[PDB]
Paper text:
In order to establish whether substitution at the primary hydroxyl of CLM influences the binding of the small molecule to DraE, the structure of a DraE–CLS complex was determined. CLS cocrystals in space group P3 were reproducibly obtained using small-molecule concentrations between 1 and 15 mM. The aliphatic ‘tail’ and the nitro-benzene ‘head’ group were traced within this electron density. Positional and temperature (B) factor refinement confirmed that CLS was present in the binding site at full occupancy, with an average B factor of 32 Å2. No difference density was resolved for the succinate tail, implying that these atoms adopted a number of alternate conformers that were not resolved at 1.9 Å resolution. With each conformer set to an occupancy of 30%, the B factors refined to an average value of 49 Å2 for the succinate atoms, compared with an average value of 40 Å2 for the rest of the small molecule. Overall, the CLS–DraE complex structures imply that (i) substitutions at the primary hydroxyl do not significantly affect the mode of CLM binding and (ii) the nitrobenzene group is not required to bind DraE. The CLS structure in space group P3 proves that substitutions at the primary hydroxyl 3-OH do not affect the mode of CLM binding to DraE. Therefore, we hoped that increased DraE specificity could be gained from substitution at the primary hydroxyl group; unfortunately, the CLS succinate in this study did not fit the surface with a single conformation and alternative substituents to the succinyl moiety will need exploring.
Dr adhesins are expressed on the surface of uropathogenic and diffusely adherent strains of Escherichia coli. The major adhesin subunit (DraE/AfaE) of these organelles mediates attachment of the bacterium to the surface of the host cell and possibly intracellular invasion through its recognition of the complement regulator decay-accelerating factor (DAF) and/or members of the carcinoembryonic antigen (CEA) family. The adhesin subunit of the Dr haemagglutinin, a Dr-family member, additionally binds type IV collagen and is inhibited in all its receptor interactions by the antibiotic chloram­phenicol (CLM). In this study, previous structural work is built upon by reporting the X-ray structures of DraE bound to two chloramphenicol derivatives: chloramphenicol succinate (CLS) and bromamphenicol (BRM).
Residue numbers in the entry:
A (entry chain A), B (entry chain A), C (entry chain A): 0 to 138
The structure:
């Protein structure tokens, strides 16, 4: 049961605002707190594995993005959490183990991992939220 | 008289150089210190508000970018200032209040905010300068 | 013998992985440690000088990227080095002096600087490696 970092990093960012929302500069992913309903999509994460025919593809969340079997985006100040579910768009089987989301079967998997709001969190404080996922393999 | 953060962040960057200027890597906004003449344009900042029919759109500068009713880009080391004026390209009326630039009338305004050199500053030390503006609303 | 910073910054990034490599998110430059063979190209660095007819174009590496006449990409944690050679793709003559790579002749040079693995380093620890180069001039 261990993760070996071996791959690149994907960063999922979301800015939460109030109903009166002021977008400054280039387009980024932003939602009102009212839009943070259960199962609301936050964004996709592409995964492309190579040379993993005999290993289980895995993604490890940054330390600040997990606790107690749960994943969450975290505010810039490290204070506020936005709980999420992480799920492949296909029908593949994965397991969660202490910040690690790994594939049940070996193979050089390619696919999309979706990040979804876990439980309505319409009271989330406005701010910039991040989830960082690093590629590697589990055993 | 208070700002509520509610929106995204726009970052205005400028690299100041000497006459002999060496651009490394991708194109970025760069000027010689000799080009930092009064009213010289540094760049535009897009603003798009939504759901603000009953609020005054506002932009708040990072703490390190204002003092004494004045705005400035700040060097990477926090030491050197480049004083600027912030002005909408249209004929709309705005007010400055302690790092906050807010619109006089309520409404979901969309427009361009220009950043301009305030007073000739042709002796500015070469370096990378930044101005950070966060969207929200004032009352 | 001194460098005057005057220009922009180019950042060369490389993620080193094991054979089982998991790419997460957008495409970035990544190699297996087995690919870090001698003279292996890491990437190009564009250089465009202006107003340097009477100066020697120069690039200075960040402090953490050089020591003892040698250049290296450095890991995120500052611990691990990946030694490189820096060489213009054309036939121009340059000199290295304590973290500074400068052109022997004056002139507003434009060209490509290649970054290459210096000596096989197939045991490099997986991680994210960076080399930062700032433009300016030498005398
Ligand atoms: O994406 C966001 O920024 C917010 C969520 C969204 O787009 O709503 C719905 C959306 N789904 C997702 O973002 C899920 Cl989280 Cl993967 C959409 O159906 C979609 C986008 C991208 C891809 N893809 O690249 O394969 C598949 C499906
Ligand atoms: O922009 C820079 O990088 C330097 C300033 C400049 O472009 O000089 C002149 C320029 N103006 C500005 O940058 C002002 Cl600061 Cl908005 C130009 O007229 C312009 C650019 C973009 C837009 N727009 O997007 O609507 C309107 C006008
Ligand atoms: O580049 C990488 O990401 C890895 C190295 C590579 O591309 O292998 C080979 C490659 N060379 C380089 O990257 C050297 Cl380090 Cl400049 C290629 O021949 C090339 C790329 C770009 C340019 N250019 O912009 O002028 C010239 C030549």
């Amino acid at each position: 049961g261990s993760f070996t970092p071996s791959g690149t990093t994907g960063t999922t960012k979301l800015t939460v605002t109030e109903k009166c929302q002021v977008r400054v500069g280039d387009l980024t992913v932003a939602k009102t707190r009212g839009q943070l309903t259960d199962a609301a999509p936050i964004g996709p994460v592409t995964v492309q594995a190579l040379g993993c025919d005999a290993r289980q593809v895995a993604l490890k969340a940054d330390t600040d993005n997990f606790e107690q079997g749960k994943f969450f985006l975290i505010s810039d100040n490290n204070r506020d959490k936005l709980y999420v579910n992480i799920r492949p768009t296909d029908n593949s089987a994965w397991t969660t183990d202490n910040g690690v989301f790994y594939k049940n079967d070996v193979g050089s998997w390619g696919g999309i991992i979706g990040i979804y709001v876990d439980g309505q969190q319409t009271n989330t404080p406005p701010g910039n939220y991040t989830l960082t996922l690093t590629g590697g393999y589990w055993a």
